[PDB]
C-alpha cells in the first residue's frame, strides 16, 4: 500500500519536484513533436507511388 | 478527491457509438459476402448479428444496473466468480487484448490517414509506426489532462465516423436514384458468415467500464444501449446496402479496402476525403478504448490485484494518470511486434468467452441474491437464449483455428504465477515490500497522485 493524501503533499509541494515535473511535461511535447517533425521527414524522404 | 461524474447521456451514446463503428464497417465488410456468397442474403447475415448483440447489450444493461461497480464485466465476474476467475480476465485484459487492440486500431489510423498521399502502393512502414505512436501519446495526453476533453474528443469522433457513413449511405441513395441471387443454403457456409458478422459488432460491452463516472446510471445505462446498437444496425445494414448500388460480388471479394474503391468511383477528384473519413474512424476508436483501457486497470488496483500506484488520482485534475500511463505504455510495446494481426486471432473468442461467462453469472445471481433492486429486468428466457446461441458462436472459433487456440489456452495460464507471487503471496519478502513502498512513494511524488476519497 502507498502513501496518503496530506503526507504526499508535504514533499511533492518541493521546488526540486515542481522544477523535474514542469521539465517532465515540456521534455515529453518536445519529444512528441520529434516524433512528428520526424514522421514528416520520412513521408516527404519517402518515394511517391509509381503513377497509373 | 475521487473520480468525477462526467458522462452525460450523449456521452456515453458517442462512447458506444464510436468503439463499436470501427473500420470494419469500411474495409472488411466483405467479411460476411465471402462465406454468405448473395448480397441479398449478406444484407439480413448483418441484421441478424444487429438483433443478437442487441439481446446482449440488454443483459448488460441489467448487470450494469444490478451490478454498479463499474470494473465492466472484470467486475461482474469477480462479485459472482470471486478473486482468481476475474484476475484471469484481467491480466489478459492488461497484457494482450486492450493494448494489442489499440495498437491494431492506431495503425489502421496511421495506414488510411496516410494512404492519399500513396495511393496505389503500401504506405511507408517507418512511418506508420510513428504516426501510430503519435496518436496514441496525444490520445492519452488529453484523457490525462481532462476528463471533460476526453469526452468531447470522443463526441467529434463519434460524430465524425456518422458523418462519414451518411456519406457512404446518400451516394448510394443518388445511385439507387439513377437506376438471393447465387446464395448459399448451407449451414456450414452461414453460421460462419454470422460469426465473421459479429467482429464487426464487437465493441458494445465497452460502455459497461464507465458506469462509475456516468451521470445517472439506471436512467442513461439503458438508455444509452437502447440508442446506440438500432442506430448501427441500421447504419450498417444501410452502408453495406450502398456498396451493392456501385460494386459487383466479385469486384467486393477481391476489393483491399471497399469504402475507398467506391469512393473513388463516386467522388473522383477529392475522392480522398473517404481515406482521410476511415482514418478519422479510427481516431476516435483509439480515444475510447484508451479511456475504458485506464477505467478498467483502475478497479484492478482497486480490487487489490494490481499494485496500488494504479489507484492514485491526480487530486487537481481528477483523471487516473498513473492508468493511463500503464495503458500508454502496454500499448506502444506492440510497435515492436512481427506478424501481429493473428496473434490477436486466438484470443478473438475470449471476448465471448467472458461475455457468456458474465451471463451465466448474472443468472447465478438471479437465485443467489434474488432480493436485490434491479431497476432493470428483462425475460427470464432472453439471456439463456443469447448464452445458448453465444456458445454456439464461441464453438466455431476453435473448430476455425484449434492450433492457435492452443496457443491461446496456453498464455492464459501466464496468470496462475502472476496470482500467486502477487494476489496471494501474504508479503514474506520484507526486502522487496521496502522497494515496492520505495518506488509507490517515487511515483506518487514524481506524478503528484494520491489515493481515492471513498
Redesign the interface.
Known amino acids: 500500500?502507498?502513501?496518503?493524501?496530506e503526507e504526499?503533499?508535504k514533499?511533492?509541494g518541493s521546488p526540486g519536484?515542481v522544477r523535474?515535473?514542469w521539465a517532465?511535461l515540456l521534455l515529453?511535447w518536445l519529444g512528441?513533436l520529434g516524433?512528428?517533425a520526424?514522421?514528416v521527414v520520412?513521408?516527404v524522404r519517402?518515394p511517391?507511388?509509381?503513377?497509373? | 478527491?475521487t473520480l468525477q461524474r462526467n458522462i452525460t447521456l450523449l456521452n456515453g451514446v458517442a462512447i458506444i457509438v464510436g468503439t463499436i463503428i470501427g473500420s470494419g464497417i469500411f474495409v472488411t465488410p466483405t467479411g460476411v459476402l465471402k462465406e454468405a456468397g448473395s448480397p441479398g442474403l449478406a444484407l439480413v447475415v448483418w441484421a441478424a448479428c444487429g438483433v443478437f448483440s442487441i439481446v446482449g447489450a440488454l443483459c448488460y444493461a441489467e448487470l450494469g444496473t444490478t451490478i454498479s461497480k463499474s470494473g465492466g464485466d472484470y467486475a461482474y465476474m469477480l462479485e459472482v466468480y470471486g478473486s482468481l476467475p476475474a484476475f484471469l480476465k484481467l491480466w489478459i485484459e492488461l497484457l494482450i487484448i486492450r493494448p494489442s487492440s489499440q495498437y491494431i486500431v492506431a495503425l489502421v489510423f496511421a495506414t488510411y490517414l496516410?494512404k492519399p498521399?500513396?495511393?496505389?502502393?503500401p504506405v511507408?512502414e517507418?512511418?506508420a509506426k510513428?504516426?501510430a505512436?503519435?496518436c496514441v501519446?496525444?490520445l492519452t495526453?488529453v484523457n490525462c489532462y481532462s476528463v471533460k476533453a476526453a469526452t468531447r474528443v470522443q463526441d467529434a469522433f463519434a460524430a465524425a465516423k456518422l458523418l462519414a457513413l451518411a456519406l457512404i449511405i446518400l451516394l448510394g441513395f443518388v445511385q439507387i436514384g439513377k437506376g438471393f441471387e447465387g446464395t448459399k443454403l448451407d449451414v456450414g457456409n452461414i453460421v460462419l458468415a454470422l460469426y465473421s458478422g459479429l467482429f464487426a459488432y464487437g465493441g458494445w460491452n465497452y460502455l459497461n467500464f464507465v458506469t462509475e463516472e456516468m451521470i445517472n446510471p439506471y436512467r442513461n445505462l439503458p438508455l444509452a444501449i437502447i440508442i446506440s446498437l438500432p442506430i448501427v444496425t441500421l447504419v450498417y445494414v444501410l452502408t453495406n446496402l450502398a456498396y451493392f448500388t456501385t460494386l459487383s460480388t466479385e469486384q467486393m471479394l477481391s476489393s483491399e479496402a471497399v469504402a475507398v474503391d467506391f469512393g473513388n468511383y463516386h467522388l473522383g477528384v477529392m475522392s480522398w476525403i473517404i481515406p482521410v473519413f476511415v482514418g478519422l474512424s479510427c481516431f476516435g476508436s483509439v480515444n475510447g478504448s484508451l479511456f475504458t483501457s485506464s477505467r478498467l486497470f483502475f478497479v484492478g488496483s482497486r480490487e487489490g490485484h494490481l499494485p496500488?500506484?494504479l489507484?492514485?488520482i491526480h487530486?487537481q485534475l481528477l483523471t487516473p494518470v498513473p492508468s493511463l500511463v500503464f495503458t500508454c505504455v502496454m500499448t506502444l510495446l506492440y510497435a515492436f511486434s512481427k506478424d501481429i494481426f493473428s496473434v490477436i486471432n486466438f484470443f478473438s473468442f475470449f471476448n465471448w468467452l467472458c461475455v457468456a461467462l458474465a451471463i451465466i453469472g448474472m443468472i447465478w445471481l438471479r437465485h443467489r441474491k434474488p432480493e436485490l433492486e434491479r431497476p432493470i429486468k428483462v425475460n427470464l428466457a432472453l439471456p439463456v437464449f443469447f448464452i445458448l446461441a453465444c456458445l454456439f458462436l464461441i464453438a466455431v472459433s476453435f473448430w476455425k483455428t484449434p492450433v492457435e487456440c492452443g496457443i491461446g489456452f496456453t498464455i492464459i495460464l501466464s496468470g496462475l504465477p502472476v496470482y500467486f507471487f502477487g494476489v496471494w503471496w501474504k508479503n514474506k519478502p520484507k526486502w522487496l515490500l521496502q522497494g515496492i513502498?520505495s518506488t509507490?512513494?517515487l511515483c506518487?511524488?514524481?506524478?503528484?497522485?494520491?489515493?481515492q476519497?471513498t
Open positions: 500500500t502507498g502513501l496518503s493524501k504526499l503533499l514533499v511533492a519536484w523535474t515535473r517532465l515529453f512528441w516524433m512528428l520526424g514522421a520520412i513521408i519517402a511517391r507511388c509509381r503513377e497509373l | 478527491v496516410l498521399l500513396f495511393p496505389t502502393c511507408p517507418e512511418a510513428l504516426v505512436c503519435l501519446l496525444l495526453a496500488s500506484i489507484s492514485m487530486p513502498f509507490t512513494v506518487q511524488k514524481l506524478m503528484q497522485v494520491v489515493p476519497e
